[PDB]
C-alpha cells in the first residue's frame, strides 16, 4: 500500500500477559494442578502449621488403602468402643456397643468431621489410636510429606502436631489418584443419620418422603409429608423413617460444594492454633486443581480465599504436552567443534514435558536445544549433549528444560 506510511511499525504485536501474583491474607496456601503436579500459586507453602481436622484426610487415606488392599471392605461392621462414642468435638453420634459399617463411618468422618467415627476406624485398623498414629506418620513419609507429623487420628489439639500446605496438597493428589471411589464421598452434601438404628438414609430418599422431624429432639414425627405418594413408596418412607426414631441431620461444612461450580472436595478444619483451613479441589473440563488454605481468621475468608485460588487457576492456566517423549530433533553437526562436515545430530529424551502453563503463553512457546557450550566431537549415541528448552516467544526466558541425549554419532576430524 503506497497510501500509508509505516504500517509495519504501526502494527501492534500482541502483548503477553503474565498471570499476576495473587494476594490473600492467609498465612499459607498452595494451588497445584492434579495431572502435572505443577504448583501455579503458593505462599509459605513449606511453613509448618497446625493440621486441625485436615488430619482426618490421612486417616481416611489409610482407610481407603486397606479397602483397596482387601483387608477391609465398605460393608465391614466396626464395633464402637466407649472411648470412640465419648470423644468430644464434632460427632456423627455413633453409640457405644453398636456396629457401624465402614461406609457410614467414613461418611461421618469426611462429611461431618465426626471424631467418634474417626476414632472407631482408627482403633479397628491399628488396635490402639497410638499405633494408628504411627501408621499415619509412616504413610506420610512414604507419600513424601516430609514436613508433617500427626499426634492423633482426628486432629484434636495437643502434642507435637504440624503439616504444611504443600504436604497437604501432596496427600490430596495421592488420594484422588489412588482412591477415586473413596474420594467421591467428599462430594456428599450432608448426612441423614438414624441414630436409633445406627444407619444412614440417602439424601435422595429424604427428598422423596420429606419426613417431619421434631425441632428440639430430632425425633421423626411424620414418616412422609408429601401429599401424593404410591402405597408401596409410602411404606418405604415408613421403613427408612420409622415413627419415633431419632435422626441427626448435618450438612457438609465445605461451603464450596454448594457455591463453587465443579468443586467436589475436600475437607475443612479449625483449631485456635491452626485457624480456619480448607483442602479443596475443583474440576472444569478435564482440568482439576487442588488448593490448600491454612490459617484464615474466619470461615467466610477460608471459603472466599480458596474460591479465588481455584478460579484463578482454572481460568488462567492450561495443561499442554510441550514435548512428546522420543521425538527426534535433528540439526546440522558442522558447527559443533572438531566435527566431520558430512554428519547430522539427532537428539531426544525418553521423558515427556507435560506442564501447566498460562493460557496466554501457549501460542508463543518454542522448542529449542541448548547444547553444552563445550561440546565437541566425538559424541556417542546415548551421551548427554544438552537440554531441550521451551522458551516464551523469541526471548531467552525458559518455561521448561529437560536433558536431551544423543541418538547419532559424530566423528572428529
Ligand atoms: Cl489436571
Amino acid at each position: 500500500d503506497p497510501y500509508f506510511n509505516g504500517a509495519n511499525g504501526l502494527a501492534q504485536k500482541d502483548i503477553i500477559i503474565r498471570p499476576a501474583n495473587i494476594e490473600l491474607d492467609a498465612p499459607a496456601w498452595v494451588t497445584m494442578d492434579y495431572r502435572t503436579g505443577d504448583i501455579v500459586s503458593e505462599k509459605n507453602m513449606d511453613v509448618r502449621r497446625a493440621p486441625a481436622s485436615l488430619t482426618k484426610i490421612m486417616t481416611s487415606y489409610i482407610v481407603a488403602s486397606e479397602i483397596k488392599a482387601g483387608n477391609l471392605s465398605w460393608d465391614t461392621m466396626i464395633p464402637i468402643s466407649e472411648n470412640a462414642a465419648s470423644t468430644g468435638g464434632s460427632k456423627m453420634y455413633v453409640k457405644a456397643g453398636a456396629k457401624v459399617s465402614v461406609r457410614n463411618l467414613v461418611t461421618g468422618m469426611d462429611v461431618v468431621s465426626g471424631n467418634d467415627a474417626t476414632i472407631a476406624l482408627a482403633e479397628y485398623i491399628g488396635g490402639t489410636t497410638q499405633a494408628f498414629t504411627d501408621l499415619m506418620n509412616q504413610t506420610a513419609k512414604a507419600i513424601g510429606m516430609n514436613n508433617t507429623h500427626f499426634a492423633n487420628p482426628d486432629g484434636l489439639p495437643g502434642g507435637e502436631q504440624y503439616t504444611t500446605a504443600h504436604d497437604m496438597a501432596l496427600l490430596a493428589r495421592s488420594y484422588i489418584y489412588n482412591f477415586p471411589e473413596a474420594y467421591k464421598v467428599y462430594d456428599d452434601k450432608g448426612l441423614v443419620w438414624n441414630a436409633t438404628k445406627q444407619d444412614s438414609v440417602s439424601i435422595a430418599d429424604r427428598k422423596q418422603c420429606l419426613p417431619k422431624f421434631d425441632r428440639a429432639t430430632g425425633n421423626v414425627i411424620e414418616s412422609y409429608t408429601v401429599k401424593d405418594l404410591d402405597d408401596q413408596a409410602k411404606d418405604k418412607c415408613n421403613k427408612l423413617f420409622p415413627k419415633g426414631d431419632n435422626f441427626v441431620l448435618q450438612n457438609n461444612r465445605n461451603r464450596l460444594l454448594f457455591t463453587f461450580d465443579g468443586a467436589d472436595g475436600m475437607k475443612t478444619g479449625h483449631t485456635d492454633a491452626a485457624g480456619y483451613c480448607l483442602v479443596s479441589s475443583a474440576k472444569q473440563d478435564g482440568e482439576r486443581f487442588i488448593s490448600v488454605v491454612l490459617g484464615t481468621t474466619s470461615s467466610a475468608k477460608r471459603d472466599s480465599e480458596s474460591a479465588k485460588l481455584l478460579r484463578y487457576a482454572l481460568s488462567k492456566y492450561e495443561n499442554v504436552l510441550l514435548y512428546k517423549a522420543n521425538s527426534p530433533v535433528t540439526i546440522s553437526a558442522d558447527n559443533i567443534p572438531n566435527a566431520k562436515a558430512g554428519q547430522k545430530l539427532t537428539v531426544a529424551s525418553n521423558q515427556n514435558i507435560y506442564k501447566t502453563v498460562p493460557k496466554t503463553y501457549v501460542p508463543y512457546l518454542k522448542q529449542g536445544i541448548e547444547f553444552n557450550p563445550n561440546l565437541n566431537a566425538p559424541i556417542k549415541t546415548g551421551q548427554t549433549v544438552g537440554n531441550l528448552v521451551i522458551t516464551l516467544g523469541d526471548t531467552k526466558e525458559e518455561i521448561a528444560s529437560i536433558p536431551v541425549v544423543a541418538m547419532n554419532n559424530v566423528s572428529q576430524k
Side-chain angles (χ1 to χ4, degrees), residues 115-317:
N115 296 318
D116 49 1
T118 307
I119 292 314
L121 287 165
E123 291 184 318
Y124 186 89
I125 298 169
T128 62
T129 58
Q130 289 88 351
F132 188 87
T133 304
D134 286 319
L135 179 69
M136 299 174 65
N137 290 322
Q138 293 170 215
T139 299
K141 300 284 184 178
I143 304 180
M145 311 169 59
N146 296 116
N147 296 308
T148 285
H149 184 81
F150 299 111
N152 53 40
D154 50 2
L156 293 174
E160 181 174 38
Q161 196 182 136
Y162 56 82
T163 184
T164 72
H166 186 193
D167 274 12
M168 276 292 159
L170 289 167
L171 174 58
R173 184 178 186 244
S174 181
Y175 203 131
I176 313 302
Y177 175 77
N178 290 107
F179 315 120
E181 162 128 36
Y183 175 66
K184 295 181 191 135
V185 182
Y186 287 106
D187 197 48
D188 288 5
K189 306 285 121 51
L191 172 61
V192 184
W193 172 251
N194 189 335
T196 292
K197 276 146 156 265
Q198 291 282 283
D199 198 287
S200 59
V201 179
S202 146
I203 288 187
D205 280 310
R206 189 207 179 184
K207 292 171 189 275
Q208 295 182 25
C209 304
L210 289 161
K212 185 123 169 186
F213 299 102
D214 189 29
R215 43 208 154 122
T217 64
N219 279 315
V220 41
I221 287 164
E222 274 297 323
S223 280
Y224 45 74
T225 217
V226 179
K227 284 320 205 316
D228 190 88
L229 291 174
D230 280 37
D231 243 53
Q232 287 157 230
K234 256 174 179 173
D235 180 41
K236 100 158 163 185
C237 296
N238 283 116
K239 182 194 294 282
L240 298 173
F241 302 96
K243 292 191 270 211
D245 279 54
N246 180 76
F247 270 81
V248 181
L249 306 137
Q250 321 196 55
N251 294 288
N252 191 332
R253 281 187 59 182
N254 181 11
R255 292 301 313 168
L256 257 57
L257 293 184
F258 314 85
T259 61
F260 198 97
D261 211 272
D264 47 29
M266 187 173 194
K267 189 72 183 72
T268 56
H270 166 71
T271 70
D272 288 355
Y276 292 90
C277 308
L278 176 55
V279 175
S280 64
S281 190
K283 186 172 190 181
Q284 270 176 2
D285 190 60
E287 188 81 348
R288 167 186 297 282
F289 279 98
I290 293 163
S291 271
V292 180
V293 171
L294 307 172
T296 58
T297 58
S298 76
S299 49
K301 276 174 147 190
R302 169 201 71 197
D303 298 329
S304 169
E305 297 175 38
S306 292
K308 167 119 95 185
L309 294 176
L310 292 173
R311 183 189 335 116
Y312 166 82
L314 287 162
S315 69
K316 304 213 154 298
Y317 283 87

